[PDB]
Amino acid sequence: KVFERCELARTLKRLGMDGYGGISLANWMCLAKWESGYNTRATNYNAGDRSTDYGIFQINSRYWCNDGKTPGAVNACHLSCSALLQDNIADAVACAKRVVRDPQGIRAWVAWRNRCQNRDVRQYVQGCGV
């Protein structure tokens, strides 16, 4: 599923993402936007390390989910990577919450540092009623 901007903003809010780990909803929107264009079935194979990024938040198979084909990988979210390709994003959100409990927080996603950190992200939630 490819979410519309405001539809996703309210979806993430209902899932408890607003201010989760000190991260505003606008930051999560900016992350999803730049990671997948709000598309839950987005995937990106990384030929260099044989891992794959899954879903709306492009969560990586080396550490967060199990796809059975990433060498020496772990599964910290204790989910099948398939769970991150569902139209319903509850599992992806629970995993994204787990990701930010690590030392880096939202900085774990390099794209957030590239297109969201120290940027004006208010635009992602304006008019969404969140």
Given 4, 7, 49, 53, the catalytic residue: 53
CATH architecture, domain 1-130: Orthogonal Bundle (1.10)
Is-catalytic flag, 87?
Answer: no
Is-catalytic flag, 102?
Answer: no
Given 4, 7, 18, 35, the catalytic residue: 35
Structural resolution in Å: 1.8
| Tokens describing residue 56 | 């709306």
DSSP letters spanning the chain: -B--HHHHHHHHHHTT-TTBTTB-HHHHHHHHHHHHSSBTT-EEEETTTTEEEETTTTEETTTT-B-S-STT---TT-SBGGGGGSSS-HHHHHHHHHHHTSTTGGGGSHHHHHHTTTS--GGGTTTS--
User: Between the CA of residue 20 and those of 61, 62, 65, 128, what are the distances in Å?
Assistant: 23, 24, 21, 18
Query: Residue 127, Cα to own-chain centre: how many angstroms?
Result: 22
Q: Dihedral (C-alpha) 15, 19, 24, 26: value to the nearest 10 degrees?
A: 20
